[PDB]
């Protein structure tokens, strides 16, 4: 939010932690809610 990239498909972030046991952490941030505008268009048939 501070960098103003709140709207994005994917968000990478590599960030270090301070202190003597300093270490790096990697993160991918996403919020996917893929949908379809025509729910009834497709037809699914379970076979038997």
């Amino acid at each position: 939010q501070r960098e103003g990239i709140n709207a994005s498909a994917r968000y990478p972030k590599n960030w270090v932690t301070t202190g003597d046991p300093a270490r790096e952490f990697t993160m991918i941030q996403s919020a996917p809610l893929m949908l379809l505008a025509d729910p009834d268009e497709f037809v699914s048939v379970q076979l038997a």
Partner: protein
């Protein structure tokens, strides 16, 4: 130093700007900034005025080519170079401004339109892009057409993040030089997918596929920034100021008088104002007759509010802010604001000449560059089709001498005659003293010397044949 440390008595103790590159400073909100710039240019009158001033002064109505290839560098005879320049200029003059208007794929712009649209896009966007491509249609002699593309289409594909090499859909190598661009298709209406496509900047053969022109400010910059960034808030808030001042003036003027009667509204109206005698809430409308001094009774009064000055310093404050925005935009305040009053001749000359110097610099650094790039791209196809005869004894071919063969300059609208007589006196005395040249003064006037000499000789011979009078150039 002391100024940058903490501030006098604290003062700017909270001012800690995050020192970073312009990429980090601009890319995250680049789209928002460009959107605000587009909003300003579409709504605010001042922004449109400044854009039009840029359009009309950077290049103006016309933009003429002049090919001056490095004949000495290429080891070419001067007469052969002159012949080549003449034939290529003939081809360019019959091609670029064609009534076919098929210089663009959009089939609705001219070459001057190309230049001015590009310079405007750079002005209110920071950069300009033109796609120089090859069309398969053989109906035309030349199969090259252009299309300017707004910076909005150049974006990160699938609106993903950005990497070291990829920045808003721009591929840059280790040295940082850009090589390819992901351009998204237009999204009107917004109910169909926005699909990206990757395009290289140059063809494998050296033809520049995608011309990008902008003015970077620091090392590593990838996208140009519109000049309006520093003045966005000032413009927006001054627009709001003029709107609210209009509203306040409207209401304060509109409420003119009032009544303080103890009785009902309609009784007060028809015993203080009149009206009544209706035809068929809204109270009653009073016809505008004359005078009609009313009579009053104790406990009743009529008060005409005096309101106040509608422009109590608003004009001068707006004038100061207009000076501010003019300085920010780099154009003369008088030209921007149509405030051509109380100016001495020297003051007007100074403002005009400094603004014209700025405009000429912008012209040379944007329009000249873009025109040279597109002209050399066109000349590539021209010499591929051999519509122009290259000299036989050339020390170098075209592939190694793209710039040498494509060496050219441009002439837009000439130096506008502020007074005319003084300028023409200075020009003629320069010619007499031999300090200037016919080509130099014609270029400063927006002309060229070769064709003007040809026209003068033509008119000389025509009037000589007519037997009317020789002109002022004989023997």
């Amino acid at each position: 130093y002391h100024g940058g440390g903490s501030g006098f008595g604290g003062q700017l103790r909270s001012w800690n700007p995050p020192s970073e590159s312009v990429d980090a400073a601009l890319l995250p909100n680049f789209t928002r900034g460009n959107a605000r710039a587009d909003d300003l240019v579409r709504n605010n009158g001042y922004a449109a005025n400044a854009i039009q001033l840029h359009q009309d002064h950077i290049v103006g109505s016309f933009f003429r080519l002049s090919h001056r290839p490095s004949w000495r560098y290429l080891g070419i005879g001067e007469e052969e170079a002159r012949a080549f320049s003449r034939e290529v200029e003939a081809a360019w003059k019959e091609f670029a401004e064609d009534d076919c208007c098929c210089i663009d794929v959009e089939r609705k712009r001219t070459f001057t339109m190309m230049i001015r649209e590009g310079v405007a896009m750079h002005a209110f966007n920071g950069e300009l892009f033109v796609q120089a491509t090859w069309d398969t249609s053989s109906s035309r002699l030349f199969r090259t057409q252009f299309r300017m593309v707004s910076p909005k289409r150049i974006s990160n594909p699938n609106n993903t993040g950005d990497s070291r090499n990829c920045r808003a859909g721009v591929q840059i190598n280790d040295s940082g030089a850009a090589l390819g661009y992901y351009v998204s298709e237009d999204g009107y209406p917004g109910w169909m997918p926005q699909k990206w496509t990757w395009i290289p900047r140059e063809l494998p053969g050296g033809r520049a596929s995608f011309i990008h022109v902008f003015e970077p400010v620091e090392d590593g910059q990838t996208r140009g920034a519109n000049v309006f960034y520093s003045v966005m808030e000032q413009m927006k808030m001054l627009d709001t100021l003029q709107n609210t001042q209009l509203q306040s003036a409207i209401v304060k003027a509109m409420y003119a008088a009032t009544i303080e009667s103890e009785l009902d509204t309609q009784s007060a109206m028809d015993f203080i104002l009149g009206a009544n005698s209706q035809e068929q809430y809204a109270a009653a409308p009073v016809r505008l007759g004359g005078a009609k001094v009313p009579h009053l009774m104790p406990g009743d009064s009529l008060n005409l509010q005096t309101a106040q000055d509608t422009d109590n310093g608003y004009s001068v404050f707006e004038q100061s802010l207009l000076r501010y925005i003019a300085a920010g935009l780099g154009v003369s305040y008088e030209q921007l604001s149509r405030n051509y009053a109380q100016m001495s001749y020297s003051t007007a000359r100074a403002s005009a000449n400094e603004s014209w110097a700025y405009f000429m610099g912008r012209r040379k650094f944007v329009a000249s560059r873009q025109a040279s790039q597109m002209f050399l791209c066109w000349l590539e196809e021209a010499i591929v089709r051999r519509v122009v005869t290259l000299p036989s004894k050339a020390r170098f071919s075209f592939q190694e001498a793209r710039s040498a063969w494509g060496n050219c300059d441009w002439i837009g609208s000439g130096r506008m005659a502020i007074d005319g007589l003084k300028e023409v006196q200075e020009a003629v005395m320069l010619i007499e003293a031999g300090l200037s040249t016919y080509e130099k003064e014609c270029a400063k006037r927006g002309d060229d010397y070769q064709e003007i000499f040809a026209q003068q000789v033509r008119e000389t011979m025509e009037r000589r044949a007519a037997g009317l009078k020789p002109p002022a150039w004989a023997a």
